């Protein structure tokens, strides 16, 4: 049992790093170890299942196993779904993130800024803070007035929603505040 | 080996659902789950590495196991220690969330509402939006333009800093635009 | 103060058409929807389309495409609406509206209307 | 084209008494998460004044007897303590297909 005492401890010792430090804006390095465990965990649990299922004690554990290879499956083609509705919707790679299920897109620098949001709105907010534009609380970089994008985007796994600018205003020292209202919410993917 | 096949099997599925669903923002019975577990895993692990410590195939497993006991013990107390300050600077749960480490307290409707923050600011910002108060891209409540509170707090674990209101404005249909710059980071805890 | 003001009374003859015109004044009016309302004289309202000045993006009744043709004009601030085969029907006040903050669901100011005749 | 009927077509109430206006629609108008309903107010010779937007939401500047509920389906509006100037014709709109659509009218009268 010394073997597997000490298997068995290096075991949780990894357990703890991922649910402790694996998170995307504390460690990028252990976020992409997770997400490597992660579309690792699916395969190995479903060939763990169906094992039990062949090499079992009685027909209650066979069933159960079966179930249990069942609900590991769909989990694996939920989030394979997904990812990939997602994906296509946006082309960004935090499609694969299971934190976040919404993205808002803005085409700025002759770029798109892919950002995660916590709710669906209806009106997003922006404001420019001695330029430097900051939409939905997301530090984005410098920006004027004048030179605010024209439309963004907001995708999601179901729907993508399409925002317009309206209702501008300009305070002294270079900063402004602006408003994005949605129009349409039809016209899916890109 | 089947007894042990189906525990190492039902072993990998909370080690799925933990991953993939236990999130704030996601199924938070899952998140408190989530949270017991790590509060459970921290001496499990500290345990099993000091007995494979002490029942050891040689002197080298034996020091390997010494050195991961002294690991988890530091990631314990580290934890501890860190979460502990952060109760002590902002008196929320959100302390002993291990995906934040900024939290951004407000006076409102009598009461104190926590939110945490991606990064730390020199100014905040904040937007109205028909009577509907939104600072840093977090949906607060109702709020006028009047009604504004006068001071936030940001918390962290080693310093505590404080935000006055300046700089207002007023656009037509209850909607405006405010700031919050910093002016003390000393003054630690409450 | 955010304002629309409307053209003055239109008298036509049938089968000529006619262009209605609402500017605004106290805002952006590039960034702004109007949305082009209808009242019968003795009827209740009716929704024509609607004209994004800032590119020109319009959306319409299905009743109305063809007889109402929606322009913006971003220099002067202004706004148009033609109405084309004027007939007996096409008789009613047209009114124009916007949103505070610049949406296409919510009509928040008007216009004080602009009454058409069509008679000979 | 959601169609909104309104009951009654006209009303009569004292100067002091509740009155109670309602909308049906043809079909749901509750998008994702909001209802997007709309009453407006019209005096003769007048644009409409907008009262309630997303069949909760009071207007600013509209003064607090006016007071709108409903979900999906069934909307109402109230105005508890009607007064001499309530006197005009309310209706009800939608937004959430792309031809919006207006109720029929209800003419409020007053009695003394």
């Known amino acids: 049992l010394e073997q597997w005492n000490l298997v068995i401890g290096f075991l949780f010792l990894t357990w703890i790093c991922l649910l402790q430090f694996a998170y995307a804006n504390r460690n990028r390095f252990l976020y992409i170890i997770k997400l490597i465990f992660l579309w690792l965990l699916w395969p190995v649990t479903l060939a763990c299942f169906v094992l039990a299922a062949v090499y079992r004690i009685n027909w209650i554990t066979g069933g159960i196993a079966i179930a249990m290879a069942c609900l590991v499956g769909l989990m694996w083609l939920s989030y394979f779904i997904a990812s990939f509705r997602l994906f296509a919707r946006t082309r960004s790679m935090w499609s694969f993130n299971p934190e976040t299920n919404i993205l808002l897109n803005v085409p700025l620098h002759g770029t798109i800024l892919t950002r995660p949001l916590l709710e669906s709105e209806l009106v997003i907010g922006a404001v420019i803070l001695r330029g430097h534009l900051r939409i939905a609380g997301h530090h984005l970089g410098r920006c004027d007035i004048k030179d605010l994008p024209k439309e963004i985007t907001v995708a999601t796994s179901r729907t993508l929603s399409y925002y317009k600018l309206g209702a501008s205003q300009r305070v002294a020292g270079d900063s402004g505040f602006a408003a994005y209202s949605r129009y349409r919410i039809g016209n899916y993917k890109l | 080996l089947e007894q042990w096949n189906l525990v190492i099997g039902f072993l990998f599925l909370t080690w799925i659902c933990l991953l993939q669903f236990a999130y704030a923002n996601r199924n938070r019975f899952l998140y408190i789950i989530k949270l017991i577990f790590l509060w459970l895993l921290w001496p499990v692990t500290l345990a099993c590495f000091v007995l494979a410590a002490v029942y050891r195939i040689n002197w080298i497993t034996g020091g390997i196991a010494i050195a991961m006991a002294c690991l988890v013990g530091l990631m314990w107390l580290s934890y501890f220690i860190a979460s502990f300050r952060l109760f002590a600077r902002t008196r929320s749960m959100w302390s002993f969330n291990p995906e934040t480490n900024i939290l951004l307290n407000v006076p409102l409707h009598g009461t104190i509402l926590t939110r945490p923050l991606l990064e730390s600011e020199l100014v905040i910002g904040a937007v109205i939006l028909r009577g509907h108060l939104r600072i840093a891209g977090h949906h607060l409540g109702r709020c006028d333009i009047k009604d504004l509170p006068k001071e936030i707090t940001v918390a962290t674990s080693r310093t505590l800093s404080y935000y006055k209101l300046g700089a207002s404005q007023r656009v037509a249909g209850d909607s405006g635009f405010a700031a919050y710059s910093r002016y003390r980071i000393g003054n630690y805890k409450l | 103060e955010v304002q629309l003001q409307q053209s003055g009374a239109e008298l036509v003859r049938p089968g000529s058409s006619v262009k209605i015109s609402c500017k605004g004044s106290?805002?952006?009016?590039?960034?702004?929807?109007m949305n082009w309302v209808k009242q019968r004289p003795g009827q209740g309202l009716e929704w024509i389309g609607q004209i994004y000045p800032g590119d020109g993006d319009t959306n319409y009744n299905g009743k109305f495409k063809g007889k109402a043709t929606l322009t913006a004009d971003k220099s002067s601030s202004t706004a148009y609406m033609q109405l084309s085969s004027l007939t007996s029907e096409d008789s009613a006040v047209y009114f124009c509206?916007?949103?505070?903050?610049?949406?296409?669901?919510?009509?928040?100011?008007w216009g004080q209307g602009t009454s058409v005749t069509v008679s000979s | 084209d959601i169609v909104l009927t309104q009951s009654p077509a006209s009303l009569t109430v004292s100067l002091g008494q509740r009155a109670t206006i309602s909308c049906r629609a043809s079909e749901s108008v509750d998008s994702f998460g909001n209802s997007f309903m709309h009453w407006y107010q019209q005096k003769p010779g007048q644009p409409p004044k907008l009262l309630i937007y997303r069949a909760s939401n009071l207007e600013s500047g509209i003064p607090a007897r006016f007071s709108g509920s409903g979900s999906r389906t069934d909307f109402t509006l109230t105005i508890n303590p009607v007064e001499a100037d309530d006197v005009a014709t309310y209706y009800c709109?939608?937004?959430?297909?792309?031809?919006?659509?207006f109720g029929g009218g209800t003419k409020l009268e007053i009695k003394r």
């Open positions: 509206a916007s949103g505070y903050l610049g949406e296409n669901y919510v009509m928040d100011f």
């Open positions: 106290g805002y952006v009016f590039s960034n702004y929807w």
């Open positions: 709109q939608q937004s959430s297909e792309d031809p919006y659509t």
